[PDB]
Amino acid sequence: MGYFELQLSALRNVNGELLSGACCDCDECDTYVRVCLKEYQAKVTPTGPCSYGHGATPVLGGNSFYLPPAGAAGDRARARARAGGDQDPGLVVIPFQFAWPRSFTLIVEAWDWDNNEELLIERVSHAGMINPEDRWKSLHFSGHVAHLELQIRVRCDENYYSATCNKFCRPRNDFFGHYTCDQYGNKACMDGWMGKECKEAVCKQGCNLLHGGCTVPGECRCSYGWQGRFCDECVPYPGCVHGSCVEPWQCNCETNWGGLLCDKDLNYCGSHHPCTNGGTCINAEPDQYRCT
Numbered sequence: 083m084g085y086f087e088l089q090l091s092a093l094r095n096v097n098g099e100l101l102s103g104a105c106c107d108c109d110e111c112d113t114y115v116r117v118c119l120k121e122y123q124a125k126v127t128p129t130g131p132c133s134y135g136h137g138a139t140p141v142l143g144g145n146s147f148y149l150p151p152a153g154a155a156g157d158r159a160r161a162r163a164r165a166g167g168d169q170d171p172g173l174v175v176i177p178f179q180f181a182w183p184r185s186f187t188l189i190v191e192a193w194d195w196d197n198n199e200e201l202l203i204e205r206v207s208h209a210g211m212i213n214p215e216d217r218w219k220s221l222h223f224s225g226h227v228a229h230l231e232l233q234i235r236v237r238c239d240e241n242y243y244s245a246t247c248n249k250f251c252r253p254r255n256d257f258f259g260h261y262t263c264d265q266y267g268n269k270a271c272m273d274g275w276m277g278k279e280c281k282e283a284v285c286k287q288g289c290n291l292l293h294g295g296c297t298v299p300g301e302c303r304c305s306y307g308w309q310g311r312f313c314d315e316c317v318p319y320p321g322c323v324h325g326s327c328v329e330p331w332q333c334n335c336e337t338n339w340g341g342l343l344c345d346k347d348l349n350y351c352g353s354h355h356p357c358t359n360g361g362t363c364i365n366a367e368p369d370q371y372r373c374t
Contacts, residue, residue: 083238085175085176086134087173087175089172089232089235090232091149093146095145099203100227101205112144113141113203115193116138118190120134121186122209123187132189134186161173178247184246187208192228204226206230216235259281261279289301289302294313307330316330319342322344324339340368350371351363351371362374
């Protein structure tokens, strides 16, 4: 989810001494750096172990040495994607899979390699607060023996966001969604897609989505009972002749037309009539009458 970085750039012990006042023999030390990441507290500044993680460098040089800068690129794959023998000492990487508490206590030590605790060169502490910012932060110190220049930074892992590295967002384009992720870790639906999970597609423009749908963006496939390019006209009762529909399977007959399929003339005589001698016809039952 995230990792704490430490970039050592300079360490200076001109006298070549230990913190105990003794000599590294004042013919030079073999200096390596330990890093202790633990809980930040209140008043009870001394309690034991590195609960948030720990790190160590190999011997980097002698009494005093200066380390090159790195590169404002490859930052992610240099610290979190390499095989054994990570050939960059001075970069201490402490990954974490919990919610970053922001408040922390950093203890950085300088040691002498010999082959024991009486070989500590310099111990340095600093408790404070830091947020997952992609910007380094400089820390300089001047102890009784050594002088150190550090650069620390907290960083959310790729696809993890927010100031606690807990919000997750990984880009996707498959069965379960079509989207990317943004600055703040929210989903950005790819063009043609919508919805809370960028799962629902955008259909043909004009498609009545009350009765139509689409599996691929740009389609318009109607439901059962609706038809047309836009799925907006109902399918009437098959056999409907003098009728219409508003809902599917309806055969709403027209004026003076009746029966199921609207094929029965109720006003037989006011239309194609049968009367004789200018008498008088009257409508009587579908397709029937009386002409007197």
